[PDB]
Design a protein around this ligand. Sequence first.
Ligand SMILES: [Zn+2]
Ligand SMILES: [Zn+2]
Lengths: 114, 115
Amino acid sequence: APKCIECHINIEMDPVLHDVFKLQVCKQCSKEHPEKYALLTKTECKEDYFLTDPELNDEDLFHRLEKPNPHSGTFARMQLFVRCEVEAFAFKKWGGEEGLDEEWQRREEGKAHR
Amino acid sequence: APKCIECHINIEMDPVLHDVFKLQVCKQCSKEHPEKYALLTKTECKEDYFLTDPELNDEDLFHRLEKPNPHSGTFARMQLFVRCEVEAFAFKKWGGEEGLDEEWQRREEGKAHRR
DNA sequence: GCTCTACGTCATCA
DNA sequence: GCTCTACGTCATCA
Ligand SMILES: [Zn+2]
Ligand SMILES: [Zn+2]
């Protein structure tokens, strides 16, 4: 029977990372590796990685988990993305982790200026 | 025998102004009163009256005629609005003809201000 | 550490 | 004298 790609031991996969994000990863390894497996809200994806609504809204581009808005169920649904997917897209977008850090810099100058 | 509200004479209403815009006006009177009856594109509505896409996209708020884009059938459809409806909404928005001018005035100052 | 839309402009592509 | 979307912050309201 198939094994978690992180630990090579667990055969019971985290339900969310597996069913929703297509990752053969166990709940414990997801906790141990947030740099890959942590779930980020849509808002966290824009502030951390400077992705736009059109790229995050693209059904064809990111897998996503939706939950009721924790502020109120009458508010727009919370959207959760897996860090490895969003990071990989942002690195292609801005050019690796350095490109991203240069774009970070670039905006502080903007906020300062403005 | 219902009459054009403008001339009170013609019995045959402009088919566009009547079917699409609900206006009991003959074609001849539409040409003689462009200040009420001229059809404006979506773009001329934003330029002339500072209405937004959300306003003009509201299906419940303006009648609209759609035509194929004259630049190309593959481009987004042309949308035609009747000046009297558009003008009346812009007069409420900006507070009359004077407020529309006052808003005109301020954007020129902005596009001198932006080098 | 919640999300959508709108303001706002203009360009670009369609 | 063609239209949509995107880029920008954001704020507001939901
Ligand atoms: Zn594991
Ligand atoms: Zn008439």
